[PDB]
Design a protein around this ligand. Structure first.
Ligand SMILES: Nc1ncnc2c1nc(Cl)n2[C@@H]1O[C@H](CO)[C@@H](O)[C@H]1O
Length: 385
């Protein structure tokens, strides 16, 4: 029953996803708000602790006590220059507890501090409860994914997050490996298969090259930009609309925090529409000083606004190919991961770079990692019996 069941969890920097392999198919499980992905956010309020959508929805009102980006801290020392650099951009407090970072917040009127693995365990507990509500029984066995470049300390702290969350961690697997499993790229018989995973998420960009020799995976190269993702494209749209509002009304909205946030969420939505329509409309009632902001933008203008950012995704692709000592024609498969890979210009740039090649994109890119993890969790729990 529950002991013969296992889930696959993609514990992402900005969003998390949970899947279950049953009756010959993967089911990506929708949360209680009907969403197939859940924000990796934890909010501490005057009455409760919020996780996911409810935590993301109140981030504007409670920025000091809304934790996100715990994956950027997990398994790291406080003195790490990555931690020191990132801390300058977060609205929550990061403290030092014997060279280990802790996030410090106000919860129910009291000062509390949490290890990154305790924050990630609250995200994992939520994914576990989402699976349990779908299945009708508690599931405890899980496969949890991590980036291919995570070292032993980051992998161990992720497994610790799983234990705190009440999960039996069957295995910690690499995100590009789970994505290759989702597409069945390890079941092509004999002979070495070279796979490139192009993973463009909400806040990070990763390129991974894997060799699959008779079911055995080997990471040949990892490249990317830890500070490039979908949110940079939302911000390019924000700057455009701030300049358009200034041209139409001769008023600068940039300093009004509420106006900028409402414009930001509307921009994120319009950006998503631009992946399937050639135009999107913004409909903001009383954006600033009682002025409605009803406008539109073409996909052509959006592509111009992010042109340099889209083109920059090809430098880590070339870098990974040189590190792996492989030419483009030596790559057998191209896999898309992350919601931002739905952007048509991004697909066109990657396809043209690989000389007109087909892309593996039939599985929802923001769900491919959880899909593969769910497949692996089923194989692993079956072998355990
Ligand atoms: N249809 C889409 N077109 C463009 N961007 C998208 C789309 N869906 C998501 Cl999610 N994202 C973005 O992916 C990230 C999460 O993986 C977020 O930045 C989200 O906006």
């Amino acid at each position: 029953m529950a002991k013969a069941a296992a889930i696959g969890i993609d514990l992402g920097t900005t969003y998390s996803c949970v899947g279950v392999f049953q009756h010959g198919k993967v089911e990506i499980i929708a949360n209680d708000q009907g969403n197939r992905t859940t924000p990796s956010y934890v909010a501490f309020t005057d009455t409760e602790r919020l996780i996911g959508d409810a935590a993301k929805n109140q981030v504007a009102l409670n920025p000091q006590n809304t934790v996100f980006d715990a994956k950027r801290l997990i398994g790291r020392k406080f003195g790490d220059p990555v931690v020191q650099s990132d801390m300058k951009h977060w609205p929550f407090q990061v403290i030092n507890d014997g060279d280990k970072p802790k996030v410090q917040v106000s919860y129910k009127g009291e000062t509390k501090a949490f290890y990154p693995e305790e924050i990630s365990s609250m995200v994992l507990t939520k994914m576990k409860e989402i699976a349990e509500a779908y299945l009708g029984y508690p599931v405890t066995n899980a496969v949890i994914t991590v980036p291919a470049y995570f070292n032993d300390s980051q992998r161990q702290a992720t497994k610790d997050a799983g234990v705190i969350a009440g999960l039996n961690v069957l295995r910690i697997i690499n995100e590009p490996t789970a994505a290759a499993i989702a597409y069945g790229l390890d079941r092509t018989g004999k002979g070495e298969r070279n796979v490139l995973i192009f993973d463009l998420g909400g806040g990070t960009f990763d390129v991974s090259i894997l060799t699959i020799d008779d079911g055995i995976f080997e990471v040949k190269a990892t490249a990317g930009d830890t500070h490039l993702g979908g949110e940079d494209f939302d911000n390019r749209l924000v700057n455009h609309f701030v300049e358009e509002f200034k041209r139409k009304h001769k008023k600068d909205i940039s300093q009004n925090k509420r106006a900028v946030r409402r414009l930001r969420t509307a921009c994120e939505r319009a950006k998503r529409t631009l992946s399937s329509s050639t135009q999107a409309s913004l409909e903001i009632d009383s954006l600033f000083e009682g002025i409605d902001f009803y406008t539109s933008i073409t996909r052509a203008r959006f592509e111009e606004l992010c042109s340099d950012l889209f083109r920059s995704t090809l430098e880590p692709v070339e870098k990974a190919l040189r590190d792996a000592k492989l030419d483009k024609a030596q790559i057998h498969d191209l896999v898309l991961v992350g919601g931002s890979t739905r952007i048509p210009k991004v697909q066109k740039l990657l396809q043209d770079f690989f000389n007109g090649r087909d892309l593996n994109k039939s599985i929802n890119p923001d769900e491919a990692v959880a899909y593969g993890a769910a497949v692996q969790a089923a194989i692993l729990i079956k072998s355990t019996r």
